Design a binder for this molecule. Sequence first.
Ligand SMILES: CC1=C(/C=C/C(C)=C/C=C\C(C)=C/C=C/C=C(C)/C=C/C=C(C)/C=C/C2=C(C)CCCC2(C)C)C(C)(C)CCC1
Lengths: 154, 95, 175, 165
Amino acid sequence: DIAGLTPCKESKQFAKREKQALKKLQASLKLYADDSAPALAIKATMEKTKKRFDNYGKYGLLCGSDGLPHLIVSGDQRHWGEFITPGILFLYIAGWIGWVGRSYLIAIRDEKKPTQKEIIIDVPLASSLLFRGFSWPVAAYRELLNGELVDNNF
Amino acid sequence: PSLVISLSTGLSLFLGRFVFFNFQRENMAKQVPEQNGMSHFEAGDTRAKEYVSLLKSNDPVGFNIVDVLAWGSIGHIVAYYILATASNGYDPSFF
Amino acid sequence: MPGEPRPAYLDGSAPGDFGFDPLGLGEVPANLERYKESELIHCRWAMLAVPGILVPEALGYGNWVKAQEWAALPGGQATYLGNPVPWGTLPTILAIEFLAIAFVEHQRSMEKDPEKKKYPGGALEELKVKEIKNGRLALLAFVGFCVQQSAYPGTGPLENLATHLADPWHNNIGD
Amino acid sequence: PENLRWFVQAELVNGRWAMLGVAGMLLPEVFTSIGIINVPKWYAAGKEEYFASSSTLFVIEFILSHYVEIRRWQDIKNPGSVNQDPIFKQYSLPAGEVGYPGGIFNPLNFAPTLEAKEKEIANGRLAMLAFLGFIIQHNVTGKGPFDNLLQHISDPWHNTIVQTL
Ligand SMILES: CC1=C(/C=C/C(C)=C/C=C\C(C)=C/C=C/C=C(C)/C=C/C=C(C)/C=C/C2=C(C)CCCC2(C)C)C(C)(C)CCC1
């Protein structure tokens, strides 16, 4: 409800330009609609869509003039998450690749002699080398801030 | 609805600070000099300053700023002009 | 340093040179390492603005306030004239009291020895913890509530009939 | 294995706050009966009181909390700690943190500390499996039943995600 941008439910545009945009693919009477492939340009799909119409709805995004999702989190109201509730994971999903990324490498001086010892990967991964990826920060993310860094290692 | 002060007090406040200083003690610091010809910075030298050049004239300095502004400035424009004519044309305290 | 490592309020035990073997603050650094204008001033201040404040009575009898007591100051003076001065109000009265004050602790300027601290050795109530050591709790005692005195200045520091305000705000405003 | 006697207490602390944590909503736990997602508070109460919201039960009872917890922290740090249950040892006889302050930089070892029975420890973690049952339902299926000879292992119904909420 903030800055504009209305929650979709007053429908004005979006919902209609929608029930327009998608719905002249629908005028695909211009073929023969029964069973097809070769055609189904009409009947289905709209299932994902129109039979997801008033569905999408539904949490607002306060989709806005034009009548489309102006997608915003910034840390106000329910939204504090339309990208943050799915905004952290990414952080999470990446830099523990860094762990594998690190400990894969930080092995590539152990057992001794290295590099292409980088090309032949010694199938490097599946558990703790990754499956620590699971559990890094605020329990041990300060794998950073002691003996591994510094750095302090040799 | 504004007293034009604070500022216009401080536009004078340190004006009055370098009419200031230094009648007698030869010719008003040092010495004099520096002028043209150039004696100072990156001809060579270029160093190395203190600052206790304050402390002298301060106790003095306060008086003159923060009342003549009420005898000069916001102190009439004064009689006097006399002399006389009278007087400059003699003036309304303008107003 | 930062934490979770630190920092020896956990006794010593304790003090403590000897003892039992300790440190603890790190044997006497200085966030100025030399040192003042702003330091120990954080102290004798608010001891003695805050006594000046006891003065607003709780009143259950009536008070207020004197004979001349300035009429919120704006125009009960002087009535002059002589003449005639300011209005009064504005910069002029607000000019006298100033540089009058402005000279009193600035002749103090000249200071170096007699006596600069302990400094190397000795070989204001003299040695005084108490009378001075309050210096702290007499500052923030004050802000402590002038925070609300710039928060919700409702009407009269009746303070608690309700709770401990504690409102709570939340740390945000929100969360 | 994994690592060194780093946190014990941290997670111990956790397991301490744990059982009586899962004792908390363990009132909704229903002696026999009285549950749901909660609002109230032990029994009674009726002073003046413990209140809302220009008050909150929060900041009052949980500012002062801070010095009650920092004492431990700095207590850990500079040991510091009883004589000695929690950091660490006197009686009798838990799972040993075992080590002393340093390694070869770190490893002159690191973990020969297993051995025994069922024992003391356990229940500390029990309540976090409790939790990962007990949290998951309560907004997914917000009541807790157990029901034999009736229709356990039969069911009855269905209930998924998108309904709505
Ligand atoms: C508090 C505050 C804030 C902040 C701000 C800022 C911006 C500041 C600055 C600050 C600082 C002082 C900073 C620094 C930082 C640092 C860093 C450093 C970052 C990061 C990082 C990285 C780079 C990482 C890496 C890694 C890790 C660590 C983990 C994962 C993996 C890897 C290894 C990759 C806010 C916003 C809230 C506002 C108010 C106040």
